[PDB]
Amino acid sequence: EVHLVESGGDLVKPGGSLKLSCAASGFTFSHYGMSWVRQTPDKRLEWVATIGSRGTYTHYPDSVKGRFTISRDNDKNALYLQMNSLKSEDTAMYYCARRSEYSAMDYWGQGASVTVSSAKTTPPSVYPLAPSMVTLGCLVKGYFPEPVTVTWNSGSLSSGVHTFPAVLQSDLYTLSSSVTVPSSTWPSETVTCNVAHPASSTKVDKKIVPRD
Amino acid sequence: DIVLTQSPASLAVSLGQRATISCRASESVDSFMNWFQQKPGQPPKLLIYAISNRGSGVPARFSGSGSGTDFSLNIHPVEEDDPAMYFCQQTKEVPWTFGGGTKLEIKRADAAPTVSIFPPSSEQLTSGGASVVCFLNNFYPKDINVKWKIDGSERQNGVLNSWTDQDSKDSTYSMSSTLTLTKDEYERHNSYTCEATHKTSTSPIVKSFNRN
Description:
Distance between the termini of chain B: 64 Å
Assembly: dimeric
CATH architecture of the largest domain in chain A: Sandwich
CATH architecture of the largest domain in chain B: Sandwich
Chain A: Monoclonal anti-c-myc antibody 9E10
Keywords: antigen-antibody complex, antigen recognition, long CDR H3, immune system
Entry title: The structure of the anti-c-myc antibody 9E10 Fab fragment
Radius of gyration of chain B: 23 Å
Strand content of chain A: over 45%
Largest sheet of chain A: 7 strands, mixed
Helix content of chain B: under 10%
Distance between the termini of chain A: 53 Å
CATH topology of the largest domain in chain A: Immunoglobulin-like
Number of helices of chain A: 0
Helix content of chain A: under 10%
Largest interface: A-B, 46 and 45 residues
Largest sheet of chain B: 7 strands, mixed
CATH class of the largest domain in chain B: Mainly Beta
Number of strands of chain A: 19
Order of helices and strands of chain B: EEEEEEEEEEEEHEEEEEHEE
PDB class: immune system
Radius of gyration of chain A: 21 Å
Order of helices and strands of chain A: EEEEEEEEEEEEEEEEEEE
Oligomer: heterodimer
CATH superfamily of the largest domain in chain B: Immunoglobulins
Structural class of chain A: mainly beta
Shape of chain A: elongated
């Protein structure tokens, strides 16, 4: 199967630069042109750049022309996107995509998150939420930047989970996650949610223990 | 610069029905018109290209048509797994552009939320903070109001709400409401209540606890 894995996303100061990479697998890289597309918080999609399969050509939209540069290394099956002179306006989720045949973007990367702001990294505070079935939860408060991922019991608990979109609370993000289980499971067994905030290399496990 | 306009913005359709989304191009496109499907947490996926060809892997359920300026995507039968963001795209010429995006929501029977209220954990209290959390899970329709009451009196400040996208299994919604207070405020009152008032039952579902 065609696969495009991205990496390099992060928070950068306005004016700073950032290099995003996309690793292709599952096809003859050099036989296909490639593109980068971004999606701003307003959920709108915006084409950012494309490069020929050989790399003999590359063009961009006026919004980034002169600041962004697309590159590819067919020898290492990688696509790149160098961003310089970054602006707050550039904060978005960035995706790489393959161009087919006619020609269309049939395959996309998982997306890299880029945040351009003067705010510095702030790790989260993780608090356990303890009260037929039972619902437990985790409060992930005051962090920056997005995102964070949450897991329950290292990923074992995968169903009956609800992780809510983060919300800005005074320059800082907060979100919570809930998991519903049969009374049989809790408190009999131990339930712990796993919170990870890459930006701050933070990694914590909070156990859900009953009170009193 | 060609401009694409999709309509409607949001579309709610019962299971089995036909889904019709439209997109109008401000200029010719000759037939460089494609449609993409984007589900939460995922990158956009190619649905239809050249306005009528389904992407390799796309089920027969989908199909697009039209010509000239405007085209449209048609899903039939609409299934539980269809709620998402749908966008049309123009590749006729640089810069490539996307429609504003249209959200497809499935329609189902009303469903009352399962409500759970959580007191501030001891950890947060030790640091001078007090967040009271309330989850309203698996309800429908999406519009629902949450009201917090402290010692019987409604609280307005310090409330952050967050809704999840529609469930792709039971087609329900879930929501989180957080009332953040200061430890000192928290210690001054005893009863805390979370109230969910809908429309499919103007009789509230309540949940509360006593600090003591």
